[PDB]
Amino acid sequence: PGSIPLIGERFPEMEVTTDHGVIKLPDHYVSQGKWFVLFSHPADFTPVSTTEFVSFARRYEDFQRLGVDLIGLSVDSVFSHIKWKEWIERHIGVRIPFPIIADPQGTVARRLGLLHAESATHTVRGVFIVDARGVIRTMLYYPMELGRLVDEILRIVKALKLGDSLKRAVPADWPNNEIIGEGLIVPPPTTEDQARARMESGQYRCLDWWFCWDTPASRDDVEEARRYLRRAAEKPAKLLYEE
Amino acid sequence: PGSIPLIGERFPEMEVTTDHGVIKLPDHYVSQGKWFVLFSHPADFTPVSTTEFVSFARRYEDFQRLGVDLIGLSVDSVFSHIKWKEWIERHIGVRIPFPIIADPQGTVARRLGLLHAESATHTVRGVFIVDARGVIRTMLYYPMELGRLVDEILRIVKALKLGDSLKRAVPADWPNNEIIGEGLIVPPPTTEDQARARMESGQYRCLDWWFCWDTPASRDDVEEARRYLRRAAEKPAKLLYEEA
Amino acid sequence: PGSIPLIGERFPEMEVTTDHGVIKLPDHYVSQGKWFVLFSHPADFTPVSTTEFVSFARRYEDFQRLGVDLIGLSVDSVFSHIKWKEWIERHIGVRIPFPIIADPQGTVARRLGLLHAESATHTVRGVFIVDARGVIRTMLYYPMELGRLVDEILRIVKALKLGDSLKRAVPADWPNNEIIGEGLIVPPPTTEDQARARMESGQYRCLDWWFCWDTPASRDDVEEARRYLRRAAEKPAKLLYEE
Amino acid sequence: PGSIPLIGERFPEMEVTTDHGVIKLPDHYVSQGKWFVLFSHPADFTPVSTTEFVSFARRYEDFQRLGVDLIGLSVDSVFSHIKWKEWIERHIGVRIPFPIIADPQGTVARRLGLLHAESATHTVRGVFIVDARGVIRTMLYYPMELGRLVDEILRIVKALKLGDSLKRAVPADWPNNEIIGEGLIVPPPTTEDQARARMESGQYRCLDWWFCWDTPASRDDVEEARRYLRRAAEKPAKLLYEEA
Amino acid sequence: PGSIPLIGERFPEMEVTTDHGVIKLPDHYVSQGKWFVLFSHPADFTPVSTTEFVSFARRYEDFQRLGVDLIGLSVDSVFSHIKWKEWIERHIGVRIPFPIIADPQGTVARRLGLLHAESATHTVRGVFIVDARGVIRTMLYYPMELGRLVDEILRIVKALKLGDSLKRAVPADWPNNEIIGEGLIVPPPTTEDQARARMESGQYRCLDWWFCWDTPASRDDVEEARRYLRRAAEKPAKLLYEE
Amino acid sequence: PGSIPLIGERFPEMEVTTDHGVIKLPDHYVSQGKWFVLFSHPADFTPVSTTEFVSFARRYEDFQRLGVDLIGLSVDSVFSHIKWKEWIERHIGVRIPFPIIADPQGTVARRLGLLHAESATHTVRGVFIVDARGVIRTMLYYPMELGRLVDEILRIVKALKLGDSLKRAVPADWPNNEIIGEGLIVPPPTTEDQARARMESGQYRCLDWWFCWDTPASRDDVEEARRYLRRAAEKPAKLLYEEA
Amino acid sequence: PGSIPLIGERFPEMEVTTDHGVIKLPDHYVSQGKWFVLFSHPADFTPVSTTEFVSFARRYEDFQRLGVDLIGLSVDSVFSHIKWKEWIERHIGVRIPFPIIADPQGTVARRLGLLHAESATHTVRGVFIVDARGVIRTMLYYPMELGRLVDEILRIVKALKLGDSLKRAVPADWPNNEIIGEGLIVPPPTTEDQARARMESGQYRCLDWWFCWDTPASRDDVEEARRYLRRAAEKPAKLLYEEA
Amino acid sequence: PGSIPLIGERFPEMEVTTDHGVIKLPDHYVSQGKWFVLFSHPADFTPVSTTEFVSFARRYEDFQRLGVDLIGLSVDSVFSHIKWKEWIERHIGVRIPFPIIADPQGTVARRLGLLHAESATHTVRGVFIVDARGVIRTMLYYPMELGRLVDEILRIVKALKLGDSLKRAVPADWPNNEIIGEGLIVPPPTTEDQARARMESGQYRCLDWWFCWDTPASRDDVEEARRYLRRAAEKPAKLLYEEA
Ligand SMILES: [O-][O-]
Ligand SMILES: [O-][O-]
């Protein structure tokens, strides 16, 4: 039994303490016309969490390019956050450029339903994808033992942004959908007159009045989405621990 | 906001109606010693949902090899479910093998918290990964407008099973983690004594006492997990609409 | 054990989604001066329901002739409603001209008390006859296993309209009542004063001061009603099954 | 602002005072293995109600032919019921053979959701069809100003009894349905396997797997039900008011 | 137990349906400067009730001269009331001139505490005497099996009016009280100074400072009151039955 | 408004203090198979009250002959009750033989609803006729300014016991009813059969099936009742204030 | 607004996670017949908190001799606790030998009222002294900006112990009280007979019947107590930062 | 447990009765720009309490030098307060200069939660340090059997005042800290940028970015603070009881 915010709702208003200072969410990013990915982890100085922060750091530029910032969250204090970041930079050679929220009393975790049955003291690995209007668009709740696949989070925001501007719905596994590949779906008619006209228009390739699509996405947009997936599928040429 | 089940909790007992008959959850699958992925979609005869079922359908064999079952869910009735399936087999050429739950009154939906602000009438694209003990292991909530990445659902299950059998935690992006590649993490010590013991054992490659790992996964484990991502990243050979 | 709206009550104001679009009840029909028959059925792609829709469809011009609209309702989505109508037109050779409300979550079903002990998920075969003032005039509840007799619904709107227009009550089995045939009943006196005055005027055929009647209904109105019943008793010469 | 018992629920157990005496519902009828139709009317000594009582009385044997009893209801006392019955027999020539419940204070009325917005003091023209198990099978609510069509009430209990005994659903306007005439409908498949089996058996005429029917009703069952409708459609040969 | 209005309270304001039409109580009578007696009976077409109605009807002229109206009440409909009045006028030869409230549902009965332990469906034989100010002056509650003595009701009203106009209290059995006969009582002093003054005045015949009286009621008034009682005591010369 | 026990209920069980001693109602009278009239009056040493007590005392023999005990009630103490009783025996020459409840604080008055608007401090002139079973049979509420007619209270008791013994209803103005004189009414049939059986037997005189009566009461019983009415109507030959 | 446990009450029973593992309080110390001092600090890697742990650590053997154990507490996790302790040992050259409760979510902090208006997320510098019976004996609440005087905590436990065994009360500034020196107070008389007895006995030096005392403490006890204070007064000869 | 005021919160506003008159807290001291130490004790004419008052009196000048006032508190009346003071002055020879609040009924006692489990009638030995803004800075709760170390209350106040003036945090045991002696700690950075800016300033002496300090306190400040501790560890030259 847990209470989580919902897709479609504005991200709960709240002032938080990060290792970059105090900021108000989602105001802080909305004001910059930025989307933001809020993600949490159990505790500082933990292995899986470290691999995740490093993964986010390496992909940071990719997020910035999409006008998407990142912000972390754990039940630890800001001193530990900073110490942990120093450890990471010193031993892994990677600098974490984004802020981490320090939520000592679980206030934030509770408002976001990040505390599950696994642990009553530490948050699981949740992910909130909020858009430039401060509206929650997607929620993922990974557990303590499983690290996230950061490239899917990039594919999600990218797909969301494309769907938003092109006024299209996105098929499964896009841009590599088995049925229409990189095609994007035209929102289904909701009335008999609409369906009738959708077919009469014959302006799109259709499988039925309720299944039409086209290919309005830029070739660069597609290639970029494909880049995320190929990076996820590729075994790294050099492993960081080797230094 | 809304209420949802939680990771670590046993799937909420319930009797549900599907196009394959009435079944109790999670007993139906727990009793078979099988994990099950419960996913929902807004409604039958909708585009994104269609592509997602086809995707699950084609990867159905991959879920079987892992001992995992699929079960869908939407507010539509069984008659619509069955007709929609017939439309897909006839027009796309793909037979949907797994059952779909009919939840006309949102009963199940409310229990699993699948009804968000994006519509008080239809469910979002939720995903519940439940292990063979009926325990919720992972939850994903996608919106109406974005289709899911089924191969990632496959990676989640395989990794979770690996972690269970090897007593290891799985690093970000496994089996292609930028730091330790395909290695698996050893649960960190939680006391000073355990911390000292770990270090003085020299039993693992370690970056610090709280970060040790090895590579206990078999080549098969690693390669199958990787195959999932490779497929997701691969540009389709031939599209299914072309001869539909 | 199920609260419902009542005869004499204004129809529960509500905005509903139908396969013809979104409309507000009862306003949509009131602003047109139309009576409307809202009826429900358990689910799309079900036998009995299909026959009832075909039957309503065939009697459509009859309702339209009277100034009465039709509007169905079930828990299925608009997508299923449209596919179901397509199947009907293709296989029965009959097009469904009226809209069908999509009520997943059964919000409308609840307000109208359409969910009974039989099923907790699908509505029974309910019928609400509402007039051009948006007032509920009659309600009928048929079970899943029994298809309605559409011609009786035509008799009802026909009779109620006449009564309102002629300011008369309609006897049982009209227009073939065993006692006064196609006669119509004059509303009974409510005071001794009135009773004496009516029996005094000798203005109507009367059995007692509380039972007077005349025959104000035009020949055409009487015949239209008789036609409804005659159709209900006539065995079809050709079954659509064979089309 | 209204509340009523529901189809599928057992008729609310209650002891009622009628002009034939006090009886226990629905037990009185259930113990005889008889179905019963309970209907109410506004008040005694009112025109429409009189024509209706005469209509039921003239068809009383038809209900007895179906093992169905009748019992009326109004907020009037037993004394009025009896006096009113005296008037009908004396002035119209028909003896009301069934009992009427006297519900002053609207106790029964309220329990059956019979008091509507139209009138706060008098019940509307409600109709409850209850089977030999004491279960409500159908409910109809007619207004003060419109008299019921008794023959349809006959078609209903007749069709319900057949659907029950033959395990079939009754199509619209039966036995004169415009699609399968007097054919009775086979309960539709709820699962895919059932659907496929239903189609391969070829033991029924079908438009689709969810729409199959056959003609199991006897010719007598069919003509009798059609007779009810034929009767409702016939203009009287002799108006009772004449030799009244 | 139950709840009834109280002596001294205003008759509970209400609109009522009678067989003479709708009327508001007590306003309808207050406005005419008339007192009114409201009495109930269990049901129409019942023996005792019928005898009481014939008795009221016989004394109608007596109440009328006193400026008192009559109105009955039962849970039967207005239709039963008219038929019941017709039965009495035809089979007894007496016409009931006053209205009868039709109270199905027992709405009024509850307001006046007329439903007792005897019957939960029918009203007992209650009697409410209301003056011109619309004030309840006396309440009687007779059982089902016991008809009322209408003459005592007239005595009550007569005495009550005299007391009001004469500023006097009425002794027991007036006008035939065993101590002062037809004399009326002077309201007793309530302070020591009054008890003394009343005594030092010698203006009234007194047994004590608190028991003084005189004879202010005219012969006519006294005679009318005795008339009421004489009639109650007299054995009927002819019986309406034999006629 | 106010709460009051009802006709048909058993008199509210209570222990009361009287100027004759403490007693329990209605047990004190029930146990000795006696009926009892409980009447109240505002306060001791008040004129109208004094006249009613004298009136009651004068009729004590008649009430006793019917097996009816009397008992008064006011909010004064037992000390005033006795002084007032002494004043009456001395200045009126009449001795009050029945007990009087002393209800300071109005506890008993509240239970019987004797405190109306007129006075929140003193009780009105209530009357409670209670039978040998402890059941309330009639209730009269007279105001402060109007003394009761004690002879009608006698007629009521008399009519009641008679109705109870002969199993008959008592018409208005009995025993001088205008329609049936000293006749007593036979409880009306409540069912169609009963109604016909009553008519078929023609064993009673009847105006209709619901109005039958006979003359079962003895001459002595009838004459006693008329005696009460004759006294209420007779002008006093000797006024007690003079004989004083 | 805040609620804290109280002197005289038993330390709230609870299971806590420390960097030494899980232990039950106060049972874990009670079962050993030991007294324990629970103290908290805002967060790991903070300056004053570090100077404090180093101070407790230098005095560890002293608490040891008294049969007193130490246990710290902050809202940080065990990983930070262990990392922080390594930092101290590495840079100050001092090893912290006692456990630190890791109270994320502040469950423990809330039951002990350790969260004040200063910070809603971090605890102040509280100290709970609990005896071998598990009863809270003293509570000190220092702020974020003020480090504690650890020697006074030792003076408190020592004083309490002598008080308990010698059945005496401890004067202000003991063992250097301006009035009676190292003397201990004899619990005063609570009754007049006691006061008089106490006085005519003359066994104690008294200023009045309510102020008597003696010198029951041994020189070692007094010496030990004075040692705590001398150290508190003395300025370290060697500052640990010099060779850090 | 129980409820108490919290550090950070403004002292509960109230009007209290002292043996010096009626004053409002904390307004009376705030308005003078003074801090005040509120301490309580169980009852007047009790040994330990007496030693404590004597201790505070002797140090009254030291508190005054710092601009800090003293005010006591107990459930006794003002009369006992004054009689008790007269006793101490004539028998011990020490005048108590500060006021004492008289709280019979324990009103103030509850507001400050000074009633613990041992006694439900007398306050325990509490201490509240309040600054010139009326804010609570520190709270100490000593038991009945243990007298306070007044010199530590002095060290707490002066340190707290230094910290505010110098914008510094005070290390454990200051001015005799084992790590930095009489140096004061600079408030730690709370952001990555502040952290790097501090390390790049070489402005102070640091063990790490979060542990930097300097020695801004004047020698006077340091030695006066050390003097307090030196006095506490010093065996009195002459005991006051010796000439009482
Ligand atoms: O009933 O008209
Ligand atoms: O702790 O500063």
PDB file of C-alpha atoms in Angstrom, chain A residues 42-46 75-80 83 87 102-107 109-110 115 120-123, chain G residues 42-46 75-80 83 87 102-107 109-110 115 120-123:
ATOM      1  CA  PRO A  42      19.003   3.810  -1.755  1.00  0.00           C
ATOM      2  CA  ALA A  43      22.104   5.321  -0.225  1.00  0.00           C
ATOM      3  CA  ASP A  44      25.426   6.981  -0.913  1.00  0.00           C
ATOM      4  CA  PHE A  45      28.508   4.815  -1.128  1.00  0.00           C
ATOM      5  CA  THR A  46      26.595   1.879  -2.635  1.00  0.00           C
ATOM      6  CA  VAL A  75      17.950   9.664   2.234  1.00  0.00           C
ATOM      7  CA  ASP A  76      21.571  10.783   2.902  1.00  0.00           C
ATOM      8  CA  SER A  77      22.773  14.294   3.846  1.00  0.00           C
ATOM      9  CA  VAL A  78      24.545  16.786   1.575  1.00  0.00           C
ATOM     10  CA  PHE A  79      27.928  16.162   3.194  1.00  0.00           C
ATOM     11  CA  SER A  80      27.841  12.504   2.302  1.00  0.00           C
ATOM     12  CA  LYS A  83      32.028  13.070  -0.194  1.00  0.00           C
ATOM     13  CA  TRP A  87      35.144   9.494  -4.184  1.00  0.00           C
ATOM     14  CA  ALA A 102      19.292  15.181   0.418  1.00  0.00           C
ATOM     15  CA  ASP A 103      16.050  13.898   1.923  1.00  0.00           C
ATOM     16  CA  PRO A 104      17.034  12.834   5.505  1.00  0.00           C
ATOM     17  CA  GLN A 105      13.521  12.505   6.911  1.00  0.00           C
ATOM     18  CA  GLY A 106      12.021  10.817   3.853  1.00  0.00           C
ATOM     19  CA  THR A 107       9.696  13.778   3.339  1.00  0.00           C
ATOM     20  CA  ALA A 109      10.410  10.026  -0.700  1.00  0.00           C
ATOM     21  CA  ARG A 110       6.980   9.785   0.917  1.00  0.00           C
ATOM     22  CA  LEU A 115       9.605   3.904   0.006  1.00  0.00           C
ATOM     23  CA  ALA A 120      11.255   1.235   5.152  1.00  0.00           C
ATOM     24  CA  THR A 121      14.352   3.399   5.502  1.00  0.00           C
ATOM     25  CA  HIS A 122      15.736   3.715   1.965  1.00  0.00           C
ATOM     26  CA  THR A 123      14.061   4.602  -1.313  1.00  0.00           C
TER      27      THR A 123
ATOM     28  CA  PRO G  42      23.234  16.132  13.178  1.00  0.00           C
ATOM     29  CA  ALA G  43      25.192  14.397  10.394  1.00  0.00           C
ATOM     30  CA  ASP G  44      28.381  12.614   9.415  1.00  0.00           C
ATOM     31  CA  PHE G  45      31.247  14.622   7.980  1.00  0.00           C
ATOM     32  CA  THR G  46      30.463  17.690  10.104  1.00  0.00           C
ATOM     33  CA  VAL G  75      20.084  10.220  10.283  1.00  0.00           C
ATOM     34  CA  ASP G  76      22.881   9.100   7.984  1.00  0.00           C
ATOM     35  CA  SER G  77      23.293   5.515   6.735  1.00  0.00           C
ATOM     36  CA  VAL G  78      25.724   2.805   7.875  1.00  0.00           C
ATOM     37  CA  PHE G  79      27.812   3.302   4.760  1.00  0.00           C
ATOM     38  CA  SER G  80      28.409   6.967   5.573  1.00  0.00           C
ATOM     39  CA  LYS G  83      33.247   5.912   5.646  1.00  0.00           C
ATOM     40  CA  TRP G  87      38.204   9.369   7.628  1.00  0.00           C
ATOM     41  CA  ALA G 102      21.887   4.761  11.366  1.00  0.00           C
ATOM     42  CA  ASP G 103      18.441   6.335  11.731  1.00  0.00           C
ATOM     43  CA  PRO G 104      17.293   7.302   8.221  1.00  0.00           C
ATOM     44  CA  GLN G 105      13.633   8.390   8.159  1.00  0.00           C
ATOM     45  CA  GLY G 106      14.141   9.522  11.759  1.00  0.00           C
ATOM     46  CA  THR G 107      12.054   6.854  13.459  1.00  0.00           C
ATOM     47  CA  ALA G 109      14.902  10.468  16.435  1.00  0.00           C
ATOM     48  CA  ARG G 110      11.168  11.039  16.681  1.00  0.00           C
ATOM     49  CA  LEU G 115      14.265  16.768  16.121  1.00  0.00           C
ATOM     50  CA  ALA G 120      13.453  19.516  10.728  1.00  0.00           C
ATOM     51  CA  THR G 121      15.710  16.938   9.070  1.00  0.00           C
ATOM     52  CA  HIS G 122      18.665  16.521  11.416  1.00  0.00           C
ATOM     53  CA  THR G 123      18.772  15.787  15.133  1.00  0.00           C
TER      54      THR G 123
END
